[PDB]
């Protein structure tokens, strides 16, 4: 289970994709995930939400023509979602948030 800031950040930079324990929000739903039930680990044990497009709505991450962002949950094991996220660009810039996107830190 690679779900820590550094393990996932290293993985992304080394393999240019997320570790196998990640699934998108649509995929999860497909398995029976109901966010308000907090039942992700019941329907997809060992999985964490990750890989969806990140629209950087407050414009806090750096933009560039051709650059798209995506995000993944960090430190999740089971129950309801937490406030930690890893943010990664199409050109492999990596940021983290531990405060539900109020602030970001560049980590790669």
């Amino acid at each position: 289970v690679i779900n820590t800031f550094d393990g996932v950040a290293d993985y992304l930079q080394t393999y240019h994709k997320l570790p196998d324990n990640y699934i998108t929000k649509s995929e999860a739903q497909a398995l029976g995930w109901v966010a308000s039930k907090g039942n992700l680990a019941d329907v997809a044990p060992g999985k964490s939400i990750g890989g969806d497009i990140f629209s950087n709505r407050e414009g806090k991450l750096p933009g560039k023509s051709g650059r798209t962002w995506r995000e993944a949950d960090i430190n999740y094991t089971s129950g309801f979602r937490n406030s930690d996220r890893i943010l990664y660009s199409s050109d492999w810039l990596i940021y983290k948030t531990t405060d539900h996107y109020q602030t970001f830190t560049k980590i790669r």
Binding site: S36, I49, E58, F80, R81, S83, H100, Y101
Partner: protein, 87 residues
């Protein structure tokens, strides 16, 4: 799940986020930003949902309000079962 916004009681953007936090039963860590709102509509909030937003224009003045409404519409576009009533 029904959420009511009394647009005339919204005196700032913080007011808006605070109302949303209560009305949508958002997480205590709720970020009070548009990215945090998107995350919650798509990976927290209970559906079906009814958003009743009164005096939209007064709230608009005071905040903002439009950007937030826009997140609700994208979430719906994408399939979330959200009914939006603009009174």
């Amino acid at each position: 799940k029904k959420a009511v916004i009394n647009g005339e009681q919204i005196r700032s953007i913080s007011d808006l986020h605070q109302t949303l936090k209560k009305e949508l039963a958002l997480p205590e860590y709720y970020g009070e930003n548009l990215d945090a709102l998107w995350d919650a509509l798509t990976g927290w909030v209970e559906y079906p949902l009814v958003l009743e937003w009164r005096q939209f224009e007064q709230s608009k003045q005071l905040t903002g309000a439009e950007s937030v409404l826009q997140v609700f519409r994208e979430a719906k576009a994408e399939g979330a079962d959200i009914t939006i009533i603009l009174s």
